[PDB]
C-alpha cells in the first residue's frame, strides 16, 4: 500500500 504516486511526496498532493 506504500509505493503509489499519492504517497510519493512529503506535502500532500492537491
Amino acid at each position, epitope marked *: 500500500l506504500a509505493g*503509489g*504516486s499519492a504517497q510519493s511526496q512529503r506535502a500532500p498532493d492537491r
Partner: antibody
Amino acid sequence: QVQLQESGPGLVKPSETLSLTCTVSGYSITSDYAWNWIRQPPGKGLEWIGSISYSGITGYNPSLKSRVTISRDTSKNQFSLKLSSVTAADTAVYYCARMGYDGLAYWGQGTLVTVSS
Amino acid sequence: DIVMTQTPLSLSVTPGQPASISCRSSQSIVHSNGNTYLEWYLQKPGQSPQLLIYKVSNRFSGVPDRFSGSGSGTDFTLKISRVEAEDVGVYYCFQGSHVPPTFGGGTKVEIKR
C-alpha cells in the same frame, strides 16, 4: 541537474542475489519523492519492482515481494535493490527512477543484468 | 493489480499526420484523493523511457505542444497531433493510483514513408 546512475551491467549466477545501486546527484534522496526500481525483460514491457520513499518507507510489487529488498544509503546518496533466488526470468534491463505526483520525471540509463552460469 | 491494455499494438503514420493511442484499465485509476495518476511515456530506441504526460493531460513541457492526453476512469487517449520523424519509438501508459503501479504493454509508433 537531477541525475540518476545505476551500477554497471553483468552476470549473476542463477539462485544467487542480483544486486544493484542507484547513485543520485543534484538532489538529496531524503528531501522528497520516491525512489523506484523498474525492469524490462528482453523484448517485453516495463514492470514496477518497488520503491523507497524520501522517508525510508518501502513498497513492493506483491508478485515479487518475497524475493525483493530495497534500501537507502544516505551517506552515499544511493538506493539499492536486491533480488534473490534469481533465474533466467530475471534477466532484464533494470532502471532506477524518481517518482512524484507529477510522474517519473527522471530515469537512470538502464543496466542489463544477465542471469546465467 | 490493474491491467493497462493499449491499443493498437503498433501504428504507422505519415509525417505531419495525427495519431491516437488508447489505454484502458481493468479498474478505475481514480485515487481516493481525487487525482488520476495516469501518465504517458515514450521510449526511443535504446533509451530510458521519457515522461510526456502526467495526471491525465498535463504536458511534461508545461506548454502547449503536439502531445495531448485525455480520458477518465478506465479509458484514456494519447493524441499526437502532427507526428514527426523524431517521435518514433514505443509509447506506454502508466498508472500510479493503485499499488502496484503498472504500465501498458506499449504501442510501437513508426513513420509511414
